[PDB]
């Protein structure tokens, strides 16, 4: 029954991303995740392109942070372009491990 609320949420989501640093930074939302054991394995599963990309992005990002400089307005990550490229990989890794637990449990 979500038509107006969810619609507001969709608008809100763009604002949330805009509110979020990653969009401002220009780095992808997927790249931002707390590097833990599951993320870690997902990470490892990335293709050369995807994966080298995430290395430059973070390189460019930690460079900026070191210099307290923001990227130009023209070169920023736009919410409409939410590459959730880790998501696919990250889901399974979890999926596998949740199972593992099920098999281990019984």
């Amino acid at each position: 029954a979500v038509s107006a609320s969810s619609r507001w949420l969709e608008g809100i989501r763009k604002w949330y991303y805009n509110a979020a640093g990653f969009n401002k930074l220009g780095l992808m939302r997927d790249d931002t995740i707390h590097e833990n054991d599951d993320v870690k394995e997902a990470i490892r599963r990335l293709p050369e392109n995807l994966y080298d990309d995430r290395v430059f992005r973070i390189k460019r990002a930690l460079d900026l942070s070191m210099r307290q400089q923001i990227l130009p307005k023209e070169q920023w990550t736009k919410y409409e372009e939410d590459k959730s490229y880790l998501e696919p990989y990250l889901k399974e890794v979890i999926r596998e491990r949740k199972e593992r637990e099920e098999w281990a449990k019984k």
């Binding site: 637990e101 281990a104 449990k105 019984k106």
Partner: protein, 43 residues
Amino acid sequence: LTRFLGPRYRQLARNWVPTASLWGAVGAVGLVWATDWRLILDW
């Protein structure tokens, strides 16, 4: 939390209680010497 809970685990818990149960008894003995309850002494 949720992951730890399991249908399979029960034997370990049962085993743990005895070792745990045995361990629990030691503390009472250990505490008692320090505590020196007159009632404990009376026992």
